[PDB]
Structure 1
Amino acid sequence: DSLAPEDGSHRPAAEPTPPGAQPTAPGSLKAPDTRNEKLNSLEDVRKGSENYALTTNQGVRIADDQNSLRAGSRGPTLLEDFILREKITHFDHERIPERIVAARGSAAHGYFQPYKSLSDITKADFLSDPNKITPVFVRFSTVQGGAGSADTVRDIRGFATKFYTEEGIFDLVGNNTPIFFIQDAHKFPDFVHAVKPEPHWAIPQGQSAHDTFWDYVSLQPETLHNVMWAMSDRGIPRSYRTMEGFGIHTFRLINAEGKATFVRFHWKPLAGKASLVWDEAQKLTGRDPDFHRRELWEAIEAGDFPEYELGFQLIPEEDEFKFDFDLLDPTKLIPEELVPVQRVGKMVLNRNPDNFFAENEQAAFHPGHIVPGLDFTNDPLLQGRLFSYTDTQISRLGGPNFHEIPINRPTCPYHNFQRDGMHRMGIDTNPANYEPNSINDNWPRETPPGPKRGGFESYQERVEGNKVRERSPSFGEYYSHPRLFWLSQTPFEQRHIVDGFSFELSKVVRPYIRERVVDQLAHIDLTLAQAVAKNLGIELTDDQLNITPPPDVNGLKKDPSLSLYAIPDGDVKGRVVAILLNDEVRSADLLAILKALKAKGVHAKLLYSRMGEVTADDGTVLPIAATFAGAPSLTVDAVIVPCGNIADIADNGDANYYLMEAYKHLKPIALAGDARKFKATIKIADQGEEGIVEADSADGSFMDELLTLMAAHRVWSRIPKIDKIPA
Structure 2
Amino acid sequence: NRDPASDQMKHWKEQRAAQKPDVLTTGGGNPVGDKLNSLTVGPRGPLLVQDVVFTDEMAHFDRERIPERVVHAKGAGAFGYFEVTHDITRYSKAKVFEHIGKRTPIAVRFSTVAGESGSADTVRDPRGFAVKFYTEDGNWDLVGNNTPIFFIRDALLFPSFIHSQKRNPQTHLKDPDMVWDFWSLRPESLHQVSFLFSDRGIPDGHRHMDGYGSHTFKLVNADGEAVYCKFHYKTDQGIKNLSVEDAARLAHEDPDYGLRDLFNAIATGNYPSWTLYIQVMTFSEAEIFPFNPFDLTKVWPHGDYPLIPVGKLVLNRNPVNYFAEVEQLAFDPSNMPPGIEPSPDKMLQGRLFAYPDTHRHRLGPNYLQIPVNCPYRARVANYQRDGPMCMMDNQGGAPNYYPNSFSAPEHQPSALEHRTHFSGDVQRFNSANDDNVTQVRTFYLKVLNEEQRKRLCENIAGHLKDAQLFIQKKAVKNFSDVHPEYGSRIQALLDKYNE
Question: Into which bin does the TM-score normalised by the smaller protein fall?
Answer: over 0.9
Q: Which position in structure 1 is the counterpart of 2:429?
A: 470
Amino acid at match of 1:448: P
Distance 1:338 1:515, change over 3 A: same
Residue 529 (structure 1) aligned with residue 487 (structure 2): yes
Q: Which position in structure 2 is the counterpart of 1:461?
A: 420
What secondary structure is seen at the aligned counterpart in 2 of 1:248? coil
Among residues 385, 396, 402, which one is paired with 2:367 in the alignment? 402
Alignment of 1:17-28 (within 5 A): 20=3, 23-25=6-8
CA deviation vs aligned residue, 1:217-260 (integer Å, no higher than 9, x gap): 00011111110011111110011111111111110110001011
CA deviation vs aligned residue, 1:554-574 (integer Å, no higher than 9, x gap): xxxxxxxxxxxxxxxxxxxxx
Q: Which position in structure 2 is the counterpart of 1:3?
A: none
What secondary structure is seen at the aligned counterpart in 2 of 1:242? coil
Among residues 426, 447, 455, which one is paired with 2:412 in the alignment? 447
CA deviation vs aligned residue, 1:389-416 (integer Å, no higher than 9, x gap): 1111111012x21011011111211111
Q: Which has the larger radius of gyration?
A: 1
| Separation in structure 1 between the aligned mates of residue 416 and residue 490 of structure 2, nearest angstrom | 51
Amino acid at match of 1:504: H
Among residues 33, 48, 52, which one is paired with 1:63 in the alignment? 33
What secondary structure is seen at the aligned counterpart in 1 of 2:485? helix
Q: Which position in structure 1 is the counterpart of 2:52?
A: 82
Among residues 434, 439, 443, which one is paired with 1:485 in the alignment? 443
Residue 112 (structure 1) aligned with residue 82 (structure 2): yes
CA deviation vs aligned residue, 1:370-398 (integer Å, no higher than 9, x gap): 00001111110000110111111111012
| Separation in structure 2 between the aligned mates of residue 310 and residue 476 of structure 1, nearest angstrom | 29
| Separation in structure 2 between the aligned mates of residue 185 and residue 538 of structure 1, nearest angstrom | 37
What secondary structure is seen at the aligned counterpart in 2 of 1:100? coil
Q: Is the 8 A contact 1:102 1:145 kept in 2?
A: yes
| Separation in structure 2 between the aligned mates of residue 202 and residue 323 of structure 1, nearest angstrom | 44
Q: Which position in structure 1 is the counterpart of 2:397?
A: 430
Please provide the CA RMSD for this pair. Answer: 2.0
Q: Is the 8 A contact 2:93 2:338 kept in 1?
A: yes
Q: Which position in structure 1 is the counterpart of 2:475?
A: 517
Alignment of 1:181-196 (within 5 A): 181-196=151-166
Among residues 71, 74, 89, which one is paired with 1:101 in the alignment? 71
What secondary structure is seen at the aligned counterpart in 1 of 2:298? coil
Q: Is the 8 A contact 2:280 2:305 kept in 1?
A: yes
CA deviation vs aligned residue, 1:567-599 (integer Å, no higher than 9, x gap): xxxxxxxxxxxxxxxxxxxxxxxxxxxxxxxxx
What secondary structure is seen at the aligned counterpart in 2 of 1:184? coil
CA deviation vs aligned residue, 1:151-174 (integer Å, no higher than 9, x gap): 001001010000000111000001
| Separation in structure 2 between the aligned mates of residue 22 and residue 220 of structure 1, nearest angstrom | 43
Distance 1:431 1:476, change over 3 A: closer
Residue 126 (structure 1) aligned with residue 92 (structure 2): no
CA deviation vs aligned residue, 1:609-644 (integer Å, no higher than 9, x gap): xxxxxxxxxxxxxxxxxxxxxxxxxxxxxxxxxxxx
| Separation in structure 2 between the aligned mates of residue 50 and residue 402 of structure 1, nearest angstrom | 35
Q: Which position in structure 1 is the counterpart of 2:283?
A: 317
| Separation in structure 1 between the aligned mates of residue 383 and residue 13 of structure 2, nearest angstrom | 40
Which runs of no fewer than 5 residues in structure 1 stay unpaired?
A: 1-8, 10-18, 33-48, 450-455, 540-727
TM-score (norm 2): 0.95
What secondary structure is seen at the aligned counterpart in 1 of 2:100? coil
Which runs of no fewer than 5 residues in structure 2 stay unpaired?
A: none
| Separation in structure 2 between the aligned mates of residue 348 and residue 383 of structure 1, nearest angstrom | 29
Q: Which position in structure 2 is the counterpart of 1:710?
A: none
Alignment of 1:624-703 (within 5 A): none
Distance 1:56 1:21, change over 3 A: closer
Q: Which position in structure 2 is the counterpart of 1:548?
A: none
Amino acid at match of 2:3: G
Q: Which position in structure 1 is the counterpart of 2:265?
A: 299
Residue 265 (structure 1) aligned with residue 226 (structure 2): no
Residue 135 (structure 1) aligned with residue 94 (structure 2): no
Shift of 1:448: 1.7
Q: Is the 8 A contact 2:219 2:226 kept in 1?
A: yes
Distance 1:31 1:447, change over 3 A: farther
Q: Which position in structure 2 is the counterpart of 1:353?
A: 319
| Separation in structure 2 between the aligned mates of residue 256 and residue 489 of structure 1, nearest angstrom | 41
Q: Is the 8 A contact 1:30 1:301 kept in 2?
A: no
Shift of 1:270: 0.4
Alignment of 1:522-671 (within 5 A): 522-537=480-495
| Separation in structure 1 between the aligned mates of residue 428 and residue 78 of structure 2, nearest angstrom | 41
What secondary structure is seen at the aligned counterpart in 1 of 2:421? coil
Shift of 1:304: 1.6
| Separation in structure 2 between the aligned mates of residue 265 and residue 213 of structure 1, nearest angstrom | 29
Q: Is the 8 A contact 1:242 1:269 kept in 2?
A: yes
Q: Is the 8 A contact 1:24 1:298 kept in 2?
A: no
Amino acid at match of 2:396: T
CA deviation vs aligned residue, 1:506-546 (integer Å, no higher than 9, x gap): 122x111111101111011222212111111189xxxxxxx
Distance 1:137 1:191, change over 3 A: same
Residue 496 (structure 1) aligned with residue 455 (structure 2): yes
Residue 334 (structure 1) aligned with residue 300 (structure 2): yes
Higher relative contact order (CA 8 A, sep 6+): 2
Q: Is the 8 A contact 2:142 2:213 kept in 1?
A: yes
Amino acid at match of 1:317: F
Shift of 1:472: 4.7
TM-score (norm 1): 0.66
Residue 54 (structure 1) aligned with residue 13 (structure 2): no
Distance 1:211 1:312, change over 3 A: same
| Separation in structure 2 between the aligned mates of residue 159 and residue 116 of structure 1, nearest angstrom | 22
What secondary structure is seen at the aligned counterpart in 1 of 2:288? coil
Among residues 127, 139, 158, which one is paired with 1:157 in the alignment? 127
What secondary structure is seen at the aligned counterpart in 2 of 1:309? strand
Amino acid at match of 2:87: S
Q: Which position in structure 2 is the counterpart of 1:507?
A: 466
| Separation in structure 1 between the aligned mates of residue 245 and residue 380 of structure 2, nearest angstrom | 50
| Separation in structure 1 between the aligned mates of residue 458 and residue 246 of structure 2, nearest angstrom | 14
What secondary structure is seen at the aligned counterpart in 2 of 1:53? coil
| Separation in structure 2 between the aligned mates of residue 273 and residue 318 of structure 1, nearest angstrom | 34
Among residues 194, 202, 210, which one is paired with 1:228 in the alignment? 194
Q: Which position in structure 2 is the counterpart of 1:15?
A: none
Distance 1:31 1:88, change over 3 A: closer
| Separation in structure 1 between the aligned mates of residue 65 and residue 419 of structure 2, nearest angstrom | 44
| Separation in structure 2 between the aligned mates of residue 260 and residue 471 of structure 1, nearest angstrom | 27
Shift of 1:128: 1.3
Distance 1:50 1:190, change over 3 A: farther
Amino acid at match of 2:89: S
| Separation in structure 2 between the aligned mates of residue 22 and residue 362 of structure 1, nearest angstrom | 21
CA deviation vs aligned residue, 1:353-380 (integer Å, no higher than 9, x gap): 1111111110000111100001111110
Q: Which position in structure 2 is the counterpart of 1:392?
A: 358
What secondary structure is seen at the aligned counterpart in 2 of 1:185? coil
Q: Which position in structure 2 is the counterpart of 1:653?
A: none
| Separation in structure 1 between the aligned mates of residue 158 and residue 373 of structure 2, nearest angstrom | 26
Identity %: 40
What secondary structure is seen at the aligned counterpart in 1 of 2:57? helix
Amino acid at match of 1:354: V
Q: Is the 8 A contact 2:86 2:309 kept in 1?
A: no
| Separation in structure 1 between the aligned mates of residue 462 and residue 71 of structure 2, nearest angstrom | 24
Q: Is the 8 A contact 1:515 1:538 kept in 2?
A: no
Shift of 1:462: 0.2
Distance 1:21 1:396, change over 3 A: closer
Amino acid at match of 2:212: F
Amino acid at match of 1:482: V
